[PDB]
Amino acid sequence: AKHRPSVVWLHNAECTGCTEAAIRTIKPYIDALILDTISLDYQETIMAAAGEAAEAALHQALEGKDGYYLVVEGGLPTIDGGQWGMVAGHPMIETTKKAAAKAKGIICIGTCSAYGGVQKAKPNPSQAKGVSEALGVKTINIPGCPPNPINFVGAVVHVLTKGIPDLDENGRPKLFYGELVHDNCPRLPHFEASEFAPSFDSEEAKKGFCLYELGCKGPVTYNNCPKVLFNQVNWPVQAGHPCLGCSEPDFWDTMTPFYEQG
Amino acid sequence: PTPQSTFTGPIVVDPITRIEGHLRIMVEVENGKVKDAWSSSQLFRGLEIILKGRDPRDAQHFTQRACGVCTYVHALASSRCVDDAVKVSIPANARMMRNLVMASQYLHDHLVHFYHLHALDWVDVTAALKADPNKAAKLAASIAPARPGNSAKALKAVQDKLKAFVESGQLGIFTNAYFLGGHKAYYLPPEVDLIATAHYLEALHMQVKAASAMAILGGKNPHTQFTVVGGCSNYQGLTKDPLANYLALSKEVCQFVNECYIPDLLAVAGFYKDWGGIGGTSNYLAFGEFATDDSSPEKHLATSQFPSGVITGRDLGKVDNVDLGAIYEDVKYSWYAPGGDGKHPYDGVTDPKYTKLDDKDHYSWMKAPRYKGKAMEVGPLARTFIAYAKGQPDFKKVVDMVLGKLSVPATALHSTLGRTAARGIETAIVCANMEKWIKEMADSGAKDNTLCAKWEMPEESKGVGLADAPRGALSHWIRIKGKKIDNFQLVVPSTWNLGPRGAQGDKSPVEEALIGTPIADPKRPVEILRTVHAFDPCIACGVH
Numbered sequence: 121a122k123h124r125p126s127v128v129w130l131h132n133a134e135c136t137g138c139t140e141a142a143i144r145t146i147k148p149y150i151d152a153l154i155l156d157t158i159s160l161d162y163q164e165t166i167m168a169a170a171g172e173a174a175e176a177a178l179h180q181a182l183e184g185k186d187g188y189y190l191v192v193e194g195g196l197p198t199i200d201g202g203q204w205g206m207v208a209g210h211p212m213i214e215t216t217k218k219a220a221a222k223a224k225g226i227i228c229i230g231t232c233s234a235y236g237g238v239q240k241a242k243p244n245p246s247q248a249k250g251v252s253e254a255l256g257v258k259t260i261n262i263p264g265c266p267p268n269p270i271n272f273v274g275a276v277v278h279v280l281t282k283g284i285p286d287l288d289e290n291g292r293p294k295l296f297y298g299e300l301v302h303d304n305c306p307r308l309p310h311f312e313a314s315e316f317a318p319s320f321d322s323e324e325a326k327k328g329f330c331l332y333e334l335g336c337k338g339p340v341t342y343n344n345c346p347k348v349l350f351n352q353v354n355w356p357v358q359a360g361h362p363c364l365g366c367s368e369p370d371f372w373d374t375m376t377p378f379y380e381q382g
Numbered sequence: 383p384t385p386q387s388t389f390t391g392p393i394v395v396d397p398i399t400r401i402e403g404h405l406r407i408m409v410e411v412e413n414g415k416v417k418d419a420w421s422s423s424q425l426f427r428g429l430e431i432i433l434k435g436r437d438p439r440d441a442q443h444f445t446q447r448a449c450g451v452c453t454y455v456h457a458l459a460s461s462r463c464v465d466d467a468v469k470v471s472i473p474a475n476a477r478m479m480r481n482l483v484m485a486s487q488y489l490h491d492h493l494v495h496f497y498h499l500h501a502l503d504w505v506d507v508t509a510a511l512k513a514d515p516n517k518a519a520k521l522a523a524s525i526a527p528a529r530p531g532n533s534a535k536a537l538k539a540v541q542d543k544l545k546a547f548v549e550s551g552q553l554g555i556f557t558n559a560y561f562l563g564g565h566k567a568y569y570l571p572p573e574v575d576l577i578a579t580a581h582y583l584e585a586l587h588m589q590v591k592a593a594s595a596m597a598i599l600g601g602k603n604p605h606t607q608f609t610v611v612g613g614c615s616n617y618q619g620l621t622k623d624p625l626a627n628y629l630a631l632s633k634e635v636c637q638f639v640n641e642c643y644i645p646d647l648l649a650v651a652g653f654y655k656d657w658g659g660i661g662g663t664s665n666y667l668a669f670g671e672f673a674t675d676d677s678s679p680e681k682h683l684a685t686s687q688f689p690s691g692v693i694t695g696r697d698l699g700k701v702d703n704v705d706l707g708a709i710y711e712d713v714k715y716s717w718y719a720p721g722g723d724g725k726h727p728y729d730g731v732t733d734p735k736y737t738k739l740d741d742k743d744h745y746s747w748m749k750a751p752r753y754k755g756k757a758m759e760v761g762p763l764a765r766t767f768i769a770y771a772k773g774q775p776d777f778k779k780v781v782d783m784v785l786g787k788l789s790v791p792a793t794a795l796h797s798t799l800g801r802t803a804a805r806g807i808e809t810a811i812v813c814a815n816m817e818k819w820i821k822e823m824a825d826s827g828a829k830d831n832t833l834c835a836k837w838e839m840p841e842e843s844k845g846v847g848l849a850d851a852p853r854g855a856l857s858h859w860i861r862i863k864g865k866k867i868d869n870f871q872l873v874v875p876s877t878w879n880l881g882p883r884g885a886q887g888d889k890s891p892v893e894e895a896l897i898g899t900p901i902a903d904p905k906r907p908v909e910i911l912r913t914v915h916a917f918d919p920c921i922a923c924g925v926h
């Protein structure tokens with residue numbers, strides 16, 4: 121039996137869409153990944169143990185002789201000593217700090233762990249922060265709401281087999297986030313010709329005209345959505361809807377109103 | 383009989399794993415049976431606070447991130463809510479497309495919940511190693527449809543994979559499982575363990591297809607991007623090839639439902655027939671789903687094919703209409719400021735105020751929704767009882783099939799076993815309706831592809847969006863003022879099911895269902911998990 125690299129996966133202030141996105145992987149499928157490639161040693165969504173048994177599983181993993189990689193899903197709520205987000209009676213900030221200290225590498229799956237995400241949007245009542253801000257350490261950011269499993273599983277396999285991939289200025293792998301959504305959008309010729317839909321009921325919309333006038337953030341958003349698709353079938357603009365800019369830091373505040381460019 | 387210790391004392395389970403979100407359960411046990419319970423949600427994000435002052439068109443994008451497990455459902459409820467606030471009636475194609483995406487969500491959500499979240503409470507995976515695969519192949523022929531996946535060869539390959547995994551000493555997600563070394567509350571023969579474990583793994587692949595189907599109409603999964611005020615944006619989803627692919631993919635998913643999900647559920651239900659006397663509650667609520675008329679909240683309630691209603695005190699002879707004015711939320715036992723009790727969602731208040739862990743006076747981030755003073759269970763069981771009571775023919779037939787297979791009365795469904803069974807029942811029914819629903823949209827979209835209606839932002843208005851999400855009755859409530867969000871309140875099924883006590887000190891449904899839970903082994907209280915998981919908790923949904 122060859123040793124499989126230990127992965128510890130924590131959930132803080134999150135919707136679990138990132139976990140769900142990860143398990144949509146098909147190269148490889150998630151069962152092959154955790155049976156053959158990694159040892160997924162803590163993961164609250166799918167793990168058999170609960171309560172004190174689950175907490176002990178975490179602590180065994182954190183004390184593993186071969187070390188572990190850390191995946192973090194969710195931002196960190198810091199108000200009130202961190203008490204508005206707790207697991208096993210511990211503030212999430214405290215447990216993430218502890219897991220991060222001896223981690224071989226830290227991957228932040230999702231805009232929330234990367235940048236602070238939805239709970240961080242104004243007026244941020246929980247004083248939520250991104251992992252790198254909260255811990256004061258560099259992270260590998262796989263953002264998006266949620267990221268494509270191609271991007272997440274790609275990063276994981278890259279980290280275990282090749283090292284840290286080249287990161288952009290916001291901590292994102294250039295392999296996946298090096299290009300604007302817009303630059304690969306099939307509606308580009310419409311954008312260039314100033315052929316914009318004025319509304320979703322318009323004939324322009326029916327004809328697949330550019331969605332810029334309806335608030336599309338593709339021109340300012342770094343992601344590989346039109347190139348890789350989601351679920352092997354589709355992406356928002358193909359479904360006739362503007363991009364929300366969901367892989368950009370703080371998009372909840374920088375990209376809103378979503379249906380406008382104002 | 384049902385294994386039960388003599389244990390008297392407290393049990394705390396935190397984290398509850400195999401749910402969405404962060405839940406702490408505290409119980410008092412006396413002589414091996416739970417006598418008191420607390421459902422304590424451990425994360426607050428505050429989406430309702432975040433939404434204030436924002437563009438009402440943005441609501442659906444913020445609220446969808448209430449949950450990535452029940453992805454889509456909040457975008458839908460928000461869209462229904464804003465559609466009502468601006469008084470736009472969506473086109474027929476938009477109703478159909480919105481409803482099919484919900485049907486897709488049900489299939490994916492329920493399959494994942496049964497196998498990947500709930501099953502490990504009933505199935506001992508390590509015991510599967512003890513099974514003879516030929517004996518298991520034989521038994522599979524006698525509990526389920528013939529399929530190559532259930533062959534001795536297929537079941538051996540699963541067993542060999544599992545064996546090599548266990549022998550590596552890296553048990554991954556099975557580390558410290560409650561079934562390790564055997565457990566008195568785990569009843570299944572090793573052969574049934576093997577069979578269900580094969581499907582567990584198969585289900586990990588099938589859910590990918592269920593999500594792909596949903597994404598054809600939804601744009602992507604998780605977090606769809608196809609709904610707009612006035613209907614939908616996805617003209618491509620009315621066309622021929624995408625609809626053929628959607629049907630083809632849905633038929634694979636449903637074949638798996640009928641070949642694996644339902645037969646595994648029934649096998650588990652047969653062995654754990656004692657769980658028909660554990661974990662029952664009394665009141666049920668549903669807003670209905672799959673309506674033929676979604677022009678208003680009233681038309682939704684009245685035309686949902688999975689009907690709306692209110693049952694009280696288990697009385698199947700009196701399904702009441704839903705009074706949306708009678709819904710309110712209490713905060714007395716929650717971490718919110720004093721003064722917030724008895725608020726209708728149009729007047730909702732979300733004013734966070736933490737005290738301390740395990741403060742019996744304030745112990746959850748969920749509010750306590752109540753209906754005329756009563757707690758209401760929501761979800762598949764609530765829908766199933768309401769449809770059954772009303773003689774909905776698909777439910778009457780499938781429920782009767784289940785009661786016949788198990789040789790149990792309909793009263794046996796008021797339990798954790800029934801709750802678990804209802805989830806499968808309605809998945810089978812969604813499946814049997816997929817083709818008819820797909821054909822209706824294909825034909826409609828061929829003739830005329832109108833997908834979004836015209837509308838105007840009012841200066842001041844209010845509206846409500848209703849859905850029955852996979853976990854139950856969901857409502858979003860907006861007040862618009864100065865064309866901005868003045869108030870936006872979510873009342874979410876897991877708030878109904880898993881919230882704390884209301885202002886009268888009255889246990890919520892999960893708390894009530896937990897009373898009388900037997901504990902075979904206080905070190906490894908799987909019975910708590912069984913009942914809690916059957917409600918399919920979503921704590922990010924419940925709290926938002």
Ligand code: SF4
Nearest residue numbers: 135137230231232265
């Ligand atoms: S990044 Fe988006 S999908 Fe992922 S946890 Fe945050 S809100 Fe959910």
Ligand code: SF4
Nearest residue numbers: 305308330331336338
């Ligand atoms: S639809 Fe969006 S990403 Fe596509 S060409 Fe127009 S602005 Fe660019």
Ligand code: FCO
Nearest residue numbers: 452851852853876923
């Ligand atoms: N289903 C679901 Fe999520 C919860 N509770 C919602 O709405």
Ligand code: F3S
Nearest residue numbers: 343345363364365366
């Ligand atoms: S909203 Fe997000 S998923 Fe892609 S299309 Fe825009 S970055």
Ligand SMILES: [Mg+2]
Nearest residue numbers: 430871872873
């Ligand atoms: Mg609420």
Ligand code: NI
Nearest residue numbers: 449452920923
């Ligand atoms: Ni949910």
